[PDB]
Amino acid sequence: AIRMTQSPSSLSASVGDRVTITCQASQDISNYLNWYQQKPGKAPKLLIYDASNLETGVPSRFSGSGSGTDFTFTISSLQPEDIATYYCQQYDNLPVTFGGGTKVDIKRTVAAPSVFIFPPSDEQLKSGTASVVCLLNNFYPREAKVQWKVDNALQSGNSQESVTEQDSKDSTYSLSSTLTLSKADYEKHKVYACEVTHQGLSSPVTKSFNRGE
Amino acid sequence: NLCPFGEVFNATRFASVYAWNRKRISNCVADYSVLYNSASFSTFKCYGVSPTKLNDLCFTNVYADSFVIRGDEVRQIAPGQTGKIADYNYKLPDDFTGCVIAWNSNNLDSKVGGNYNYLYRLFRKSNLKPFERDISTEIYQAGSTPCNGVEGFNCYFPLQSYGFQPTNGVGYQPYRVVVLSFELATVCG
Amino acid sequence: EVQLLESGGGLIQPGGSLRLSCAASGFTVSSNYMSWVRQAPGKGLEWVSVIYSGGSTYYADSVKGRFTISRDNSKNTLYLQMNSLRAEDTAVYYCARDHVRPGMNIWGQGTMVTVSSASTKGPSVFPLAPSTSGGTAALGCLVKDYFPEPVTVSWNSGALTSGVHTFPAVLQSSGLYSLSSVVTVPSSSLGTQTYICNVNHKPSNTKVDKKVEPKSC
Ligand SMILES: *[C@@H]1O[C@H](CO[C@@H]2O[C@@H](C)[C@@H](O)[C@@H](O)[C@@H]2O)[C@@H](O[C@@H]2O[C@H](CO)[C@@H](O)[C@H](O)[C@H]2NC(C)=O)[C@H](O)[C@H]1NC(C)=O
């Protein structure tokens, strides 16, 4: 069975830069190699078919060349909505094989996050569990340190955080940090806050609340 | 008189696999030694018969079918095989009694700019019966709406062109095939 | 227009079975090349099976003998029968009209097949009330403790799209998934515009709407 190798695994480039990925075939596959674009969550979308031919409706900035065993896929000027994972596939010889994938990220300018904090709802507190949420909305880069402080005590291990994919419009990420405590352990403390440190901040920003007020 | 096997193997032009050519061989003394003693053949597999013990067997009719396919698709010219060729171009029965012979012809059947004279049937609603020869060019109705002989969306030309170029891999270079069918008498050895 | 709609994914114990239906519109299934392709979470794409126009079926080595592909001409629907399911069969299962010529390549949207032995639990939805910085405010919904993946969240019955960020679910130490979906709105519309998040969890057949409104004593 054929084995497609795809380089690079990951990639970050500025808006408008030339982006080129390669896909070397283990055997000769002639020119029966297609290229797909898979935006986050959505299905793969065929861009180039038969190594070099552009599917109807794809913007002109997408290119492809190669025959035999070594192929290329070129983005003329990278656009913000081009963020996705790109795969190569051969289909003439069975079984059909894919590449490892190439995740593409935009290199934009620095953006500071907007910080919001949410206490656990009184509805959830009746369930015996409390969930405090800290929000980082539309920032760049993805590197961000979130710090939970409970009565000025640094908490760790009781929190799980989650980050969106690069917004196809502004190429900004968003982060969600969730702290989980029991209703008992929640009612043993008064001051809850999250400390956000980021490149776009001259000093760490903190949003706090007092239990009950 | 001797059987005209030299006409088939040493033919100058071979047919496309969908329109595979058939020669009916009868009333002649067949010298099979010219074939199994040839070192110019890359594929030579016989079914229901022995290659060296064929000069001792009499049959009523011998059929020689010749065409051109990809090297990748030589494995499909055999009983019980499936694929774009075996299903839609040339199909052998499971009880086949004969021999399949193939050899590379990239020096003849590949042009520099790409040879497109050799074709294979790509679209068909159902598989071919054994020894079925479909030479239809009707536009293939892949959708709900009818085609009316016009190409377009869901209406495709049923044949596809091989791209026989010399720079192609072994599996993609043209191979010339000759299929001998033994039917059971006028052709012996 | 032309589109592929597929269903049948959900939770199933190992060694069990599950059939995936892929309904088509705009073309004939019995006349085209159809394919199933699965994508494990976080991994690449993996080709599974193919049915030709003439009917010849081909399968991948990792599912050969266990998976079966078929079609129904009267319903114009592609099927994928899965038997002796294993934990490594857990993936999103896209059905696609295979590319053969210029512009016939079309993919489904996939269904989540989760091969595991745990039970199904519908999610609990809790509101994330906005605070009090002058210009812009934030609010959202917590979708906590559910299994399996996935859940879908919209706002105001799809009438709200701008400024929405729905975070990927986290797998808590309890084995259940936790997820949150938020939206930034101007602080002025808090007293006059009502905000309702529309959560859907197909494996539990749970469909929840929660009012999100400010807090006050
Ligand atoms: C296929 O042809 C080769 C060579 O054919 C040449 O061109 C032909 C059109 C015809 O004019 C031949 O006379 C030409 O030689 C044949 O090669 C001979 O093969 C035999 C063994 O079968 C060998 O003893 C001879 O020495 C070969 N001739 C030469 C000149 O080397 C070959 O036999 C033909 N195959 C069949 C099945 O007839």
Numbering used by the authors:
A (entry chain L): 1 to 213
B (entry chain E): 334 to 517, 522 to 526
C (entry chain H): 1 to 131, 135 to 220
Task: Provide passages from the article that reported this PDB entry.
However, we find that some features of the binding of FI-3A are unique. The underlying reason for this behavior is revealed by the structural analysis, which shows that FI-3A is an atypical VH 3-53 antibody, in that residue S30 of the light chain is displaced some 5 Å from the canonical position. In contrast a tyrosine at 501 of the RBD is unlikely to clash with the L1 loop of FI-3A, explaining its resistance to the N501Y mutation. However, in FI-3A, residue R101 of the CDR-H3 extends towards E484, making contacts to the side chains of Q493 and Y489, and hydrogen bonds to the carbonyl oxygens of F490 and L492. Although neither K417 nor E484 have any direct contact to the Fab, they contribute to the binding of FI-3A by providing charge complementarity.
The trimeric spike glycoprotein on the viral surface is the prime antibody target since the spike plays an essential role in allowing the virus to attach to and infect host cells 8,9. The SARS-CoV-2 spike glycoprotein is composed of domains S1 and S2. The S1 domain contains the receptor-binding domain (RBD) that specifically binds to the cell receptor human angiotensin-converting enzyme 2 (ACE2) and some RBD-bound antibodies block the interaction between the RBD and ACE2 receptor, which lead to the neutralization of SARS-CoV-2 infection. In conclusion, we report fully human neutralizing antibodies that target non-overlapping epitopes on the RBD of SARS-CoV-2, functioning with mechanisms that involve inhibition of receptor attachment and the fusion process.
